[PDB]
Structure formats: structure tokens, C-alpha cells
Design a protein around this ligand. Sequence first.
Ligand SMILES: Cc1cc2nc3c(=O)[nH]c(=O)nc-3n(C[C@H](O)[C@H](O)[C@H](O)COP(=O)(O)OP(=O)(O)OC[C@H]3O[C@@H](n4cnc5c(N)ncnc54)[C@H](O)[C@@H]3O)c2cc1C
Ligand SMILES: Cc1cc2nc3c(=O)[nH]c(=O)nc-3n(C[C@H](O)[C@H](O)[C@H](O)COP(=O)(O)OP(=O)(O)OC[C@H]3O[C@@H](n4cnc5c(N)ncnc54)[C@H](O)[C@@H]3O)c2cc1C
Ligand SMILES: N[C@@H](Cc1ccccc1)C(=O)O
Ligand SMILES: N[C@@H](Cc1ccccc1)C(=O)O
Lengths: 509, 509
Amino acid sequence: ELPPRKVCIVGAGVSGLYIAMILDDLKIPNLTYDIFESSSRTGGRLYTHHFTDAKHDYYDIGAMRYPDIPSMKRTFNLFKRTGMPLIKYYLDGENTPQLYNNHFFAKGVVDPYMVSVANGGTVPDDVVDSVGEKLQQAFGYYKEKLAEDFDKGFDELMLVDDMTTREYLKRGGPKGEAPKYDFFAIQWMETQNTGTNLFDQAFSESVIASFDFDNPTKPEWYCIEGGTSLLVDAMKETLVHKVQNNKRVEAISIDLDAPDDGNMSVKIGGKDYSGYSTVFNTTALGCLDRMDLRGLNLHPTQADAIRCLHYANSTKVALKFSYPWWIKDCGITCGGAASTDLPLRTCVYPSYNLGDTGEAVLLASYTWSQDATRIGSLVKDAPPQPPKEDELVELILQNLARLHAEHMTYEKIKEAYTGVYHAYCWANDPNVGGAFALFGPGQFSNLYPYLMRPAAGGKFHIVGEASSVHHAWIIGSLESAYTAVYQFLYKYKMWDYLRLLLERWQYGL
Amino acid sequence: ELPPRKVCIVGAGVSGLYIAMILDDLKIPNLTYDIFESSSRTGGRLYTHHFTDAKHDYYDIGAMRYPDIPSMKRTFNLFKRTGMPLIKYYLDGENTPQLYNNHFFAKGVVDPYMVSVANGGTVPDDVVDSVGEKLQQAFGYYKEKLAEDFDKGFDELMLVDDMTTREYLKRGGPKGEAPKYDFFAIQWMETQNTGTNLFDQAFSESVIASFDFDNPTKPEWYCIEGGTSLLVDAMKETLVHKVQNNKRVEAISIDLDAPDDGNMSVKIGGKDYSGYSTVFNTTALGCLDRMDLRGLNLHPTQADAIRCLHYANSTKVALKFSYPWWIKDCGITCGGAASTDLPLRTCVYPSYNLGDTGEAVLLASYTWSQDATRIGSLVKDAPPQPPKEDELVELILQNLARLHAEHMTYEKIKEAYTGVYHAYCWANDPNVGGAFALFGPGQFSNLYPYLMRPAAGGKFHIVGEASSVHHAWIIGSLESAYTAVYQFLYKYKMWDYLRLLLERWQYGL
Ligand SMILES: Cc1cc2nc3c(=O)[nH]c(=O)nc-3n(C[C@H](O)[C@H](O)[C@H](O)COP(=O)(O)OP(=O)(O)OC[C@H]3O[C@@H](n4cnc5c(N)ncnc54)[C@H](O)[C@@H]3O)c2cc1C
Ligand SMILES: Cc1cc2nc3c(=O)[nH]c(=O)nc-3n(C[C@H](O)[C@H](O)[C@H](O)COP(=O)(O)OP(=O)(O)OC[C@H]3O[C@@H](n4cnc5c(N)ncnc54)[C@H](O)[C@@H]3O)c2cc1C
Ligand SMILES: N[C@@H](Cc1ccccc1)C(=O)O
Ligand SMILES: N[C@@H](Cc1ccccc1)C(=O)O
């Protein structure tokens, strides 16, 4: 018979909720848990904003789209477990505009943006129209290895993890046998492939992001109709022990002189909470670094990983319009997205309101990295009516006009704007401190192993999307939580329940 | 006589104020200007926060310290010209603690922080105690060349500008004849030299920053007694045409189908302001990228520079204490700064209140890059009292207690805290979008020439610290503003006043 044990789950995001769901499912005798959530809200970076309760009057501030690829199977099993209403998401739509250097894209014209050297720009002629082909040549070997077996593909990719994307492109790979590209060719590839400056981060991350967004299997994509927050509601409902919101952990400790299993504690608001056999920290690493972790005696390089593993910013801006003018007036009837070098960078047409004829939401700006930091600096809490008086609104409307200048005027977009919008910059969220992990050069191969290293005698686990090989996806959160529960059961020699974990949760539900 | 001409200065920071002061000094007949400032406040990144009107009850949110090195002569000339009350600033002080891996620094001790391989860390034994010496070996050649002639030293430095600092350290320089360092040695060097992740930006910037802070001439440092904003006040008082605050330029344009000199215009809140013969934009580049610049027909790589040139974040947190416990209880009597791997990173002891025995300000946290983004996520406008409930206040007090554990307790520091503090995160300022330019690899040698390329027939100038080789210093702003005025006078062949510019303003005041 198992002695009474209590574990602590720090953070009620999808990873912390997944840990509780797994523990609830295994039904281990005399085992309990507490879930402390710093925010008054539960879900973390699963966060649907509802403008009203109307059916499609929302947008997802955090996670929103899911590729049906084999490496994401655990995410889709969680969708099945909780009965999520999945519908098709259109990564690529029809008639979506692309606007660079104030020129619209056109198929089969050489250098439509007028950025090539032959047209007075600095992009080499043989690169300007061949970005996808040359990034495929740079990423494609590793992408196919990842498609056969993600873990073994990752281990081979780690042999070049010391390089940034720019570095790999500049030197022609690790030994100069790949093509070498000058600064402006690499710069154009970054402009056409990702957010500003992100090619100065890890090459391995550019490969994995390309694996996820441009997967060799050419997958179907999905969204959750009604918002991703429906997943949080369903996970919360099943909890045996409910989330305790407004409980921000500021310190974590283990008492190595105590003989007991439950010799760990966390401090919340100056008060001590002890008796825990294991602590799962599921917060973003910036939040973990603010805690007093001295009582845990972390390996010095593990502490370095908490502080230094790189995070990228992301900002989203969603506007409500009286009718879907992008559908009706521009023929953008199947989702997709418009991309531009204008400040909004990416305008995402929702896949969930394509049949609606009245009020409709447009995810008017979705940015990463410096683009998101620049948009996020306009994201305040008490903006002013009218639109022109709000700098962010006016910027978005002007960028939308230029981006859709083939069919709309600024005047008619402005008149369709209801005056209702919402924006969010994840780096300004004190409960995250960033959007998601996006490691720099050498971090996966050098710092990440020490982040995942056993701490406090195998009783402390750093959990979350950053503690995964799938950054910035729900799947990384779920894998990290599953792995941590494995280690917990292994640590306490609960062989019956570890075997049950592998039987029920390795491939599924 | 000269025909009447009008120029427009976008931005009332030190760049735009310097332009107006130069034009005021040259007294060019029938030449006028308008200065438009987006903010209700004038000064930009010269920004003193005054807790009260008491003599020393302030801290500088932006610029605060100035090294008396030859490359900084134009800044001190500006100080001299405006009668600034300069006092000595102590970059290094007495008894300043250094805290890494929860260990304090101790001279003459091997690996006092317990981070080397010999003590269970990952920092190479030959690196852990030699960061200053190995970085000097990596930067010193170029630092000495910059000391002889900054411009010629910069041009030689550009021959390795394709490399990041980490890349230069990893590969042993451009051809592998310098020492090669593994990831953890480079990581420790970054931890001990700059802010988190900044070794993943340009090697040239790490060299220039080392040249500024650790100059071979080993210079005296100075600050402005009463706050740097006294410089803004003095420059404002001299202006012939006063700053127009709350005037945010959203578009800049030139009418090439108009024969007049004054064929340029700017839009402010929908209304046009035309008749300008030249426009000086002095704003940060993120601010410029949000403007509609189509009417200027910028070179596409110049527009890329505006979007992509990298900015670093920075955040400051200052706390008021009933008495300077760092002076009286810790022997920290001569300014300096305490450095740590804790969230606050750097605690600066002011040099302007060393004789005070009552209320004193402490610049408790001064951070850059990801450190500043994480601290800045706690910077809100209406936080709660008491300190325990403001997460930022509590974090700072806790970090301060650990940093000064050799002489203070958390309880004594907390009781000395008045409850009055201020914080500021420059990336959250919509009038800047960042702290200052910190270019990535290859950006100085590739993007920066196009940023500085003549535009709109020589009538548009991108001015400011980012538009110089001295990023994040007043000197960069002054040099850029001086160079733009030169090119304006050259463009209109005002040879008499160009000669007067060189006579009075080249090494002038
Ligand atoms: C803009 C954006 C878009 C995304 N889009 C997608 C997408 O399309 N598809 C996809 O699969 N993934 C997407 N993701 C990724 C996905 O949202 C995340 O990977 C995942 O939700 C993170 O889960 P987590 O539990 O690991 O972290 P979190 O969600 O951050 O959970 C951690 C929790 O801990 C709490 N916490 C923090 N500090 C403390 C403390 N001191 N004490 C207690 N609790 C604390 C936080 O409030 C939070 O609730 C996106 C992420 C972002 C930022
Ligand atoms: C945290 C920090 C510390 C620093 N410390 C030092 C130091 O110790 N020593 C030193 O020498 N330097 C220091 N600097 C650097 C120095 O402060 C700057 O280099 C300099 O002040 C910038 O001057 P600027 O005029 O080029 O830019 P800014 O100061 O940014 O001036 C631009 C102005 O334009 C305005 N503007 C923006 N958008 C618009 C628009 N659309 N229309 C009109 N106006 C607009 C802005 O509000 C601003 O007032 C520091 C900088 C920072 C961020
Ligand atoms: N998965 C998220 C976040 C992400 C950003 C960039 C690269 C990879 C993932 C998205 O679909 O946008
Ligand atoms: N001038 C700023 C930032 C800076 C750091 C390093 C080099 C250049 C500028 C400071 O005093 O810290």
C-alpha cells in the first residue's frame, strides 16, 4: 500500500493541466496534488479572446492552429480525449496578397518586388525568386530525417546546432560544401521566411519551424471552433483537485536533512506550502528565474539555461468589421494569410467565419521578434476612440489599406471597422515574459541538456514547451509534461503505474 | 539674398535639438525650421525622473554617464556650451559586491563562483578566472586601432563585421589563428561582460562597447548634477523656433513634380505640413518604419535597414530609501556598480548623492536585452501598495538582499525602503520602440551604408544614434545631426555657411 504523497504543479497552462489529467487518469492511491496559478486566469498561452458571446466573435491570443503531422499526434489525442470541435484551418488560402517594397506579388514574373540587383536592389538575381527552393536545399536534408523519426533527426541536426541560420547560409554549411550566400541573399530569405532578425538565432530552430510549417507530408491543418480556450475549459472540468488561481510561487525548496518523501516546499505571498514529494514547474523560464531557487541547489549550467535560453516576442492585433470585406470584396474566401514588409507583417484571415456575412473578426497583425516588440510598444490598456486617435488602430488600418489596395480603399476599410479591436504582446505579460522559446546558436546542444537534468535528487522538474524539442507548440508542452510524469514514477519506483503510464499515455490518451 | 527656406525636424530628442542649435548658431538668412515632437515631453532618451524637487532626488531613465575620451569630445563641447554642472561619475567604486551562482567574488581565489569544470560546472578552468584578459585578447587589437583614429579603426573592424561575438570566439577569429572557445567559455564571457544573448549580435558592437566602457586611455567619467534633463532644458531655452509637442509625424513625402526647393511635406494627424526644402528625421528607426514613406521612394535596402537594424531593450528600476544603507552599512561610498546573475543584473550606486545622509535614490536594477524584457514585463503604471504585493518591488528587494547579504538583511533593506520607486522599459515606449541600436552580424557593413544613403534627391536625412558609428551614446546622436546639417548645406551649395559649419562645429561648441 502506497504511503500518502502530495505533489505540487506550478502553473495552470496546458502542461500543468496535462500533468494533472495524467495523474487523475492513473488514479494512484493516496497521491494528491496542488496546482498553483499566478494569474486569475487559467490556461496560460492557451487564451481565446471573446469580443462577445456570439458564435465566431473571437480570436486566439495564443495557440490557434494545429498541423496533422505524426509528431503532433499527442496534441490531437488530447483533442479527441476532450471532445474538441475541430474544423479545417487553411494555412494557405486563395487570393491572399503579398506586398514587399510597395509591390504586389505576381506569379511567374521575375523579381515582382523590384529588389534584385538587376532592378537596382541588392538581392542577388539568382536568389530573389528562389527563396523557397534555396531554403529547401538548406533545410531539406534535416527535414526529411525529422520526417522519418523526429528524435533521431533531431540528434543528427544537433551536429550543426552551433550555427545560426545566417551562419549556415553564409559559410555553405559546416564545411563549406553547401552554397554560400552574401548578406543580402540571406537577408531576403529571412524577410520572405520568418520574422525580423530570427535568422540570427539557431539554424536548428529554423529547420524545425520549417519542418512544422512546411512539412514533407503536406498535412491538413486544424483549429478549434469556438477558440482554443475550449480545451482549457474541458481540461479544467475533469480536475480532481481544482486550480488555485492568484497563487504566484516565488520560491521552491527541498529539505535534504528531512528523511521524508514530502520534504519540498514552495512559498506563495510570503507563506510556506510544504509536504511535497515532487514539484513540477511548468512556467515560462523567465518566471522561473525570478523565483528563489537556492533551496534546490541547481547545477550552475542548469541555472544558466533558465536565464539565457532565448525567447522570442509575439504580438497579435484583432479587429472587428461589420462584414468580412476580405471575403466579399477581395475574393479571400478560404482563410490563408497575407504577408508584407509593412509593420503588421502578417494578416491572417480566420478559417472559422468563412460562411458569416455580418460582423467578422480579422487577425490583422501577427508578428514575431523585433516586429512584435515594435507593434507591442503601441499595445496599451486604455486606448482612445476614435480610430485615428489610437496610433495602433490607425497603423493597422493604413497597413491593411496598402496591403489590400488591389480591391479596397483606406476609406472603405475604415468605414467597415466597427471600432472594436484587441491586441496583446506576450513579452508584456508578467506571467510569461515572452511568446515562446526560440533558442540561439548552440543552446539546444549545450544548455538544453542541463535544463532537463535531474534536480533536487530527482524531485524537481522544469516543464513546458521550452523543456521540449518542439518549441512554441502545444505538443512540446505535452511531451515535456509526459516525460516529467515518467521521471516522477520512475523516481518513486511506482513500477505498476509507470507501466500503466506507457500503456495509456505513450501513444495516446 | 538667399531665398526663404523651411526645413522640418522630426523629433525633439538631442539629435533634433542639436540640429536646431546648429542652425540657430549659423543664422542663415531667411532659413526657418519646425520641430515636431510626438510626445508631450521633449528630450527623447534624455530623461531624468524627479521623485521630488529635492536636490538629489532623481535618477536618469536614459543617458546618465559620459566617458572623457577623445571620441566623445563633441558631447563635452555640448556640455560646455550649455553650462552643464558636471561632476565625477564613478564607474568603479569601493566594496561593490559581485554575486554569481550564489557565491560572492573574492580576489586571488580560483573559481570563486564554483562554475568551472574543476568544481562541477561547465566553464573551462582556464577561462573562468580570465574573462577580462581573454576578451581583451579578442577586442584589444581593434580597441587600440579605434584609440588612434576611430574612423580608420572602424573601417578595419568592418573586415570582420560578418561575425557575431560568439562566432568570433568559437572560430578563433576570421581565419582560426586566434584562440577557439567552447560554448560554455563563450557563455561565461557573455555573462561576465554584457547582457544575456548579446554575444549573439555583432562582434563589432562588442568591440566598440568595450572601447567605450574600458577605454585604453582609462578615462575619467562624468555625470550631470541635477539630471541629464538639465541639458534638454538648456537646449530648449536657446531655440529660435520652439518645439511643437504632441505632433506625431505619420507620413513624409516629396513632390518631384514641383520645381520649388520646398517640395517636401509631412502628415500629422491627417493634416499636411508642406513647403519644406529638407526633412531631418531624428526618431528611432522603429518609429520611422511606422510612417508612410512611399512619397520618398527610398532604396529598398535602405527601407530594409529601417525595419531590420537590431535594437536592444533596456529597463531601469530606481528605489528611494530613507538613508543610503549601501554607503553607511556596506562601505559602498564611491559609486560603482554591483553585478549579479540574479534578475536585477546590475545595481548602480549613484555618484551624485555620496554626501547625503537622509533620503537617497538607488538605481537598483539596470538591465539590457532579454534581462530588460523580463524585468520590463513587471513594469506597469498603477502597481499596488504594499511592496510585498508589487511583484517588481518585491523582486528587487529580494535580489538586493541577496546581493548585499555580506552586510544587510532583507528586513533591514525593506524597512529602509520608503515605498517610492519608479521603473521604465524603453521597448514599451511607443516613441522609441527600444533602448538603442545594437546591430546584428553584418549589419554595420551591409545595411548601415544604405541607411545612410542619400534619399529624395539629397533632401531627406535619417538622423540619430542609430545613424552613427557610436550607438547608444549622445555622441552618436550629435555626430549624425552634424553630418546631416553638412549634407543639407552641401546640397544647397551654401558654401559660406558650410565653411562656417566646419569652422565652428567640427571641433566646436
Ligand atoms: C502567440 C503564440 C501563438 C501560438 N500558436 C500556437 C499554435 O498555433 N499551435 C500550437 O500548437 N502552439 C502554439 N503556441 C504555443 C502554445 O500556446 C504553448 O506552447 C503552450 O500553450 C504553453 O504551455 P505551457 O504550460 O508550457 O506554458 P504556459 O501556457 O505559459 O503555462 C505556464 C503557466 O504558469 C503560470 N505561472 C507563471 N509564473 C507563475 C508563478 N510564479 N507561480 C504560478 N504560476 C505561474 C502562467 O500564468 C501560466 O498559466 C503559440 C504560442 C504563442 C505565444
Ligand atoms: C537606457 C539608456 C541609457 C543610456 N545611457 C547613456 C549614457 O550613459 N551616455 C550616453 O552618452 N548615452 C546614453 N544613452 C544614449 C542616448 O540617450 C541616446 O543615444 C540619445 O539620447 C538619442 O537621441 P536621438 O535624438 O538620436 O533619439 P531620441 O532621444 O529617441 O529622439 C527622437 C525623438 O523623436 C520623437 N519621435 C518619435 N516618433 C516621432 C514621430 N512620429 N513624430 C515626431 N517625433 C517623433 C521621440 O519621442 C523622441 O523625442 C542611453 C540610452 C538609453 C536607452
Ligand atoms: N506554433 C506557433 C508559434 C511559432 C512561431 C514561429 C515558429 C514556430 C512556431 C505558430 O503557429 O505561429
Ligand atoms: N551608453 C549606455 C549603453 C551602451 C553600452 C555599451 C556600449 C554602448 C552603449 C550605457 O551607459 O550603458
